[model samples]
Target: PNFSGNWKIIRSENFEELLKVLGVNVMLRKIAVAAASKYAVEIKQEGDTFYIKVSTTVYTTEINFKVGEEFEEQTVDGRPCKSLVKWESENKMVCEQKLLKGEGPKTSWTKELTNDGELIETMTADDVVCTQVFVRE
Candidate 1:
């Protein structure tokens, strides 16, 4: 049951605050908010390896990694870090990001596939938590 599909963003909660926790500037925050509705994610899980592609009106980002392995990660806003991904449960995946050069706190992202065939992603950093819901496309 590989999580390989196109997921389109449907709802976002506290996204701007999450960006702020990640140290995004005010100008970029505006751009992010404006482009939030266009956000889409494509995920491909091949055995123990995984690939994630995030597309938005502002930029597109692709990430490849294997479970239980640490690798370099760079956010679209240019925050570089070492990251690790693991499966918390059968349908839930979690990624831990250690910020290498940033003013914010460390972050963890969790993605889970719902029974209704939707994908729910939650991002936590410092005191902020953002939740984004997506529908399979």
Candidate 2:
């Protein structure tokens, strides 16, 4: 299945742990997890470019790029990174990012379509992992 539609976050796990490993402060981490379920996503692909928009009640983040292109991205917690995204298979994709400054850990997120019709986003940094599950909207 393609990630071509709007989506809504249903649940998540290990979110704060992922942020803690990336050096976000306690208050930021707490606030992040508290509102995790309020996220919504819109995904679209056009020719060689893919566009992804993530939204919260207070803010929105957007990224658009072609496959295998290394581009700059700033994370929600305010870290700048050079990021690359490549597809591993027909239904699996991964993004790897290297921080441009500071002592932040390298981070990555892999996404796949599940058999039960959910999108699984597995994010990793160091040895910590965070997972968020989303359903079609």
Candidate 3:
């Protein structure tokens, strides 16, 4: 149940909407939407350490965190926040982010592997939800 593999993004649902909800500007949203298919995500876990890398044509974002521990995070879009990753189940992990900017709703990302082994990432901010599906590479 460990998320320790490389995956390519196949498609995303409500992506721009979620970005809007997150207060991402118009230009950044355009770039993100256009480069959606060019994304690759790799996840690794070693004991209590976890690493996640999100690579895109625009930039590569890396996040390292430990379970039940909160850490500071600078998001890909340049938003600073406090983040925590928690296990909901063997196959499920959720990341909660609290924005430091005094505005915008907090974001939560839930990741799970499908029965067929595809990775599904669900991100929620306020009432908006964005879901991206990735296949093993």
Candidate 4:
């Protein structure tokens, strides 16, 4: 997939926070909000190992994990869930989670990196999904 690297949110029709709540880390929430002006979300996938970086002006928070390896992950904003993640490509990341009793909605996210400090994110889930454009601040 041409989609790789960091993707930012330009606009979302649904509750964006709800999606984050589905599976994010609590520290990320506080740091993200506190450093909203400088936070950037990027995911790096090499083979089966995954690195999720939440960068901020004050600090850069990163998580190193593996796809297809099941783990209990929490959203940066305090939400909790069990996630089984995998890599589709150098840039494409696939994550399936058991947020509740059954399987949570699976999401395929792709990022188009740009040299101009801006990128586009195409997020798909079920039948409703959209592309979000974001520029680094």
Candidate 3 worst ten-residue window by lDDT: 72-81
**What overall lDDT goes with each candidate model?**
0.84, 0.84, 0.84, 0.54
Q: Candidate 3 has what TM-score?
A: 0.89
User: TM-score: which candidate is best?
Assistant: 2
TM-score of each: 0.89, 0.91, 0.89, 0.47
Give lDDT tens digits, candidate 4, residues 1-137: 33336744554333344345345466654444445544467767565676777666766666667757777765433335676666555444555545544455554445455555556555454554545566644
* Residue lDDT tens for model 1, 1-137: 56789999999998889888777998988878779889899999899888899888868889889999999987435678888888999999898887787455767888898888999988887778889999988
Q: Stretches of candidate 4 above 4 Å error?
A: 1-37, 42-44, 56-60, 87-91, 100-137
Which residue pairs collide in model 3, if any? none
**Higher-lDDT candidate among 1 and 4?**
1
Q: In model 3, where do residues sit more than 4 Å from their true spots? A: 25-27
**Mind sharing the TM-score for model 4?**
0.47
Residue-wise C-alpha lDDT for candidate 2, range 6-102, written one tens digit per residue = 9899999999999999788999899999878798878897755779898888989998888889999875467898889898987778988888987
